Structure 1
Amino acid sequence: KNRMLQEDPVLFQLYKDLVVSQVISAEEFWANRLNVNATDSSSTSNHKQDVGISAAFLADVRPQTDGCNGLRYNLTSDIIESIFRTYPAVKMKYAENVPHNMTEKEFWTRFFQSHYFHRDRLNTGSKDLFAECAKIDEKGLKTMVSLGVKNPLLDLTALEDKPLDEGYGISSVPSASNSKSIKENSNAAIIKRFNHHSAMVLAAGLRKQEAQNEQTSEPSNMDGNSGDADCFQPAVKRAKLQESIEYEDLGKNNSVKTIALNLKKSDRYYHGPTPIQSLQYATSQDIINSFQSIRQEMEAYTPKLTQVLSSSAASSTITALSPGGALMQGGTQQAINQMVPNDIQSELKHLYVAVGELLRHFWSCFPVNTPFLEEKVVKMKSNLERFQVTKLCPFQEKIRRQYLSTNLVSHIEEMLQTAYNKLHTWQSRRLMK
């Protein structure tokens, strides 16, 4: 927890004033601040080139195993560590020969110089890992027996003991099998070496989450290229049903909002004798009346010359052309009134909002009396005094002046109030013993 508060100076600057202004404790600091990022923020050091490394690094362990005589020790995993992070009994073997090669740097070259080429028989430690890997494949033999399905080692064996043959099918090699004895020895070990590298997945597949079912062949395997399984099945009338009732509710209640309803029906009621149509008669008469009046446009020749109605039209133009007396210089103390609260109190207030949001949260479920924990019902009580006291001296430091203070304190008292709201509302649901 302490490396977290030292490597991050911003959160440390947050963590300072809970000790500096004595807001909360460290016990209270790690009780309601983190609580989620214990999985999220700690997801960096655990993964680190995908831990439980099975099939990510194993592609690149052999090409990046050597740059030079000393091209090693990059960072943490650089080019040596995840080699150790797969072999376990072979890691015990590494530990066995570090004093045999004295210097660990010497070990980095020696233990891996002869094992890389063909074969490593120079030291007990190299021979330990060498012999173990034959036992590993012997150990890996027994596991493949337990699966034993889709494995024609079974199916091949039925045809060779039966005539006592397929020993000649083994012993029928052409192409000068007489006088070399070099790569015959060599390649089968490289066959063995990369099957180790192949079973290095298997040596790390157990690290994944132990990964076992071992295949009792599941005798169905129904070749299903046909059938039309068609996995997803929506459209069993779900938003069809919403549309039938909500537009019905948007029909019977079309916009019952602020201006959206109250001015609406009030002027529809003003239309009055509209089913009586006597207003509609005069309407349709006035539809018939000014029908002809528009088109002549001699009446609509001079529907312009009213400079009587220009002056007033010029007036509220000029009235809105000059608003006056509204404190043109509204700032210019704001720089002093920025740097003093945005030195501590930006972060100080943030100490509350990391907590006070949870203070809204436990009360956001409390009358159900389910999330009622002693960890929480006194966490209601805990930070209550831990915040509403530690703001009072930041409150009392700024009441050094009067109108310099009374403007900003109109906006800080919400913090006092949202505290006391929560506290005030806490007993609106009276809790028993």
Structure 2
Amino acid sequence: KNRMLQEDPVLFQLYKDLVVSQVISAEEFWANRLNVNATDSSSTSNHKQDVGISAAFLADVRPQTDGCNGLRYNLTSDIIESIFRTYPAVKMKYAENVPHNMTEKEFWTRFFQSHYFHRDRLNTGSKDLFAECAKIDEKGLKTMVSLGVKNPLLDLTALEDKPLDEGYGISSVPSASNSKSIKENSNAAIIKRFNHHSAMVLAAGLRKQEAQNEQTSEPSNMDGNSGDADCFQPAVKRAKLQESIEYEDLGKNNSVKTIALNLKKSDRYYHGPTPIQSLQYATSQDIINSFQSIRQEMEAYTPKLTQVLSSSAASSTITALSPGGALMQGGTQQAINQMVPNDIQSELKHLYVAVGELLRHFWSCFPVNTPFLEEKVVKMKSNLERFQVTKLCPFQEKIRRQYLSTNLVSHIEEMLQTAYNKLHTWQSRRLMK
């Protein structure tokens, strides 16, 4: 927890004033601040080139195993560590013997110089490395027996003990099998070496989450290229049903909002004798009346010359052309009134909002009396005094002046109030013992 508060100076600057202004404790700091990022923010050091490494690095362990005589020790995993992170017992003997047997630096080449080429028989360190891997494949033999299905080692064996043959099918090699004895020895070990590298997945597949079912052949395997399984099945009338009732509710209640309803029906009621149609008769008469009046446009020749109605039309133009007396210089103390609260109190207030949001949260479920924990019902009580006291001296430091203070304190008292709201509302649901 302490490396977290030192490597991050911004959160440390947050963590300072809970000790500096004595807001909360460290016990309270790690009780309601983090609580989620214990999985999220700690997801960096655990993964680190995908831990439980099975099939990510194993592609690249052999090409990046050597740059030079000393091209090693990059960072943490650089080019040596995940080699140790797969072989269990080889990793065991390492701390047993490095640098307990030899020099630590002399380990990294001499243990890997002769094992890299063909074969390592010069010392029992690489020899027991070499000798165990045969037992590993012997150990890996027993596991493949337990699966034993889709494995024609079974199916091949039925045809060779039966005539006592397929020993000649083994012993029928052409192409000068007489006088070399070099790569015959060599390649089968490289066959063995990369099958180790192949079973290095298997040596790390157990690290994944132990990965076992071992295949009792599941005797169905129904070749299903046909059938039309068609996995997803929506459209069993779900938003069809919403549309039938909500537009019905948008029909019977079309916009019952602020201006959306109250002015609407009030002027529809003003239309009055509209089913009586006597207003509609005069309407349709006035539809018939000014029908002809528009088109002549001699009446609509001079529907312009009213400079009587220009002056007033010029007037509220000029009235809105000059608003006056509204404190043109509204700032210019704001720089002093920025740097003093945005030195501590930006972060100080943030100390609350990391907590006070949870203070809204436990009360956001409390009358159900389910999330009623002693961890929480006194966490209601805990930070209550831990915040509403530690703001009072930041409150009392700024009441050094009067109108310099009374403007901003109109906006800080919400913090006092949202505290006391929560506290005030806490007993609106009276809790028993």
TM-score, reference length from structure 2 = 0.99
Residues of 1 paired with 2:96 and 2:334: CA distance? 70
What is the deviation of 1:315? 0.0
Residues of 2 paired with 1:101 and 1:182: CA distance? 33
What is the deviation of 1:339? 0.1
Deviations along 1:74-124, whole A, 9 cap, x unmatched?
000000000000000122233454357621111001000000000000001
Query: 1:318 matched to which residue of 2?
Result: 318
Query: 1:242 matched to which residue of 2?
Result: 242
Residues of 2 paired with 1:101 and 1:155: CA distance? 49
Query: 1:149 matched to which residue of 2?
Result: 149
Deviations along 1:121-167, whole A, 9 cap, x unmatched?
00011111100000000000000000000000000000000000000
Does the Cα contact within 8 Å between 1:352 and 1:387 map onto a contact in 2? yes
Does the Cα contact within 8 Å between 1:93 and 1:129 map onto a contact in 2? no
What is the deviation of 1:285? 0.1
> Cα 1:103–1:153, aligned 2, differ >3 Å: closer, same or farther?
same
Which SS does the other structure have where 1:171 is aligned?
coil
Does the Cα contact within 8 Å between 1:73 and 1:79 map onto a contact in 2? yes
What is the deviation of 1:53? 0.1
What is the deviation of 1:209? 0.1
Residues of 2 paired with 1:96 and 1:349: CA distance? 54
Residues of 2 paired with 1:379 and 1:251: CA distance? 48
Which SS does the other structure have where 1:190 is aligned?
helix
Residues of 2 paired with 1:210 and 1:198: CA distance? 17
Residues of 2 paired with 1:194 and 1:100: CA distance? 30
Provide the alpha-carbon RMSD of the alignment. Answer: 0.7
Does the Cα contact within 8 Å between 1:96 and 1:125 map onto a contact in 2? no
**1:386-401 → structure 2 map (5 Å cutoff):** 386-401=386-401
Residues of 2 paired with 1:237 and 1:318: CA distance? 61
Deviations along 1:295-324, whole A, 9 cap, x unmatched?
000000000000000000000000000000
Residues of 2 paired with 1:420 and 1:83: CA distance? 60
Does the Cα contact within 8 Å between 1:14 and 1:351 map onto a contact in 2? yes
Deviations along 1:312-351, whole A, 9 cap, x unmatched?
0000000000000000000000000000000000000000
Query: 2:367 matched to which residue of 1?
Result: 367
Residues of 1 paired with 2:327 and 2:58: CA distance? 71
Residues of 2 paired with 1:121 and 1:99: CA distance? 21
Residues of 2 paired with 1:110 and 1:414: CA distance? 71
Which SS does the other structure have where 2:42 is aligned?
helix
Kindly tell me the number of residue pairs found equivalent between the two proteins.
433
408-417 or 95-104, which deviates more: 95-104
Deviations along 1:354-391, whole A, 9 cap, x unmatched?
00000000000000000000000000000000000000
Residues of 2 paired with 1:163 and 1:29: CA distance? 80
Does the Cα contact within 8 Å between 1:94 and 1:125 map onto a contact in 2? no
After superposing on structure 2, the runs of 4+ consecutive aligned residues of structure 1 that deviate more than 4 Å are none
Does the Cα contact within 8 Å between 1:32 and 1:355 map onto a contact in 2? yes
Alignment gaps of 5+ in structure 1: none
Residues of 2 paired with 1:318 and 1:27: CA distance? 65
Which SS does the other structure have where 2:351 is aligned?
helix
Deviations along 1:250-283, whole A, 9 cap, x unmatched?
0000000000000000000000000000000000
Residues of 1 paired with 2:74 and 2:35: CA distance? 34
Which SS does the other structure have where 1:12 is aligned?
helix
Alignment gaps of 5+ in structure 2: none
Residues of 2 paired with 1:217 and 1:100: CA distance? 49
Does the Cα contact within 8 Å between 1:65 and 1:79 map onto a contact in 2? yes
Does the Cα contact within 8 Å between 1:23 and 1:390 map onto a contact in 2? yes
Residues of 1 paired with 2:425 and 2:100: CA distance? 73
> Cα 1:113–1:100, aligned 2, differ >3 Å: closer, same or farther?
farther
Deviations along 1:7-55, whole A, 9 cap, x unmatched?
0000000000000000000000000000000000000000000000000
Does the Cα contact within 8 Å between 1:294 and 1:300 map onto a contact in 2? yes
Identity of aligned residues (%): 100
Residues of 2 paired with 1:100 and 1:168: CA distance? 52
Does the Cα contact within 8 Å between 1:114 and 1:120 map onto a contact in 2? yes
> Cα 1:159–1:171, aligned 2, differ >3 Å: closer, same or farther?
same
91-100 or 220-229, which deviates more: 91-100
Does the Cα contact within 8 Å between 1:65 and 1:80 map onto a contact in 2? yes
Which SS does the other structure have where 1:119 is aligned?
coil
> Cα 1:148–1:429, aligned 2, differ >3 Å: closer, same or farther?
same
Does the Cα contact within 8 Å between 1:149 and 1:216 map onto a contact in 2? yes
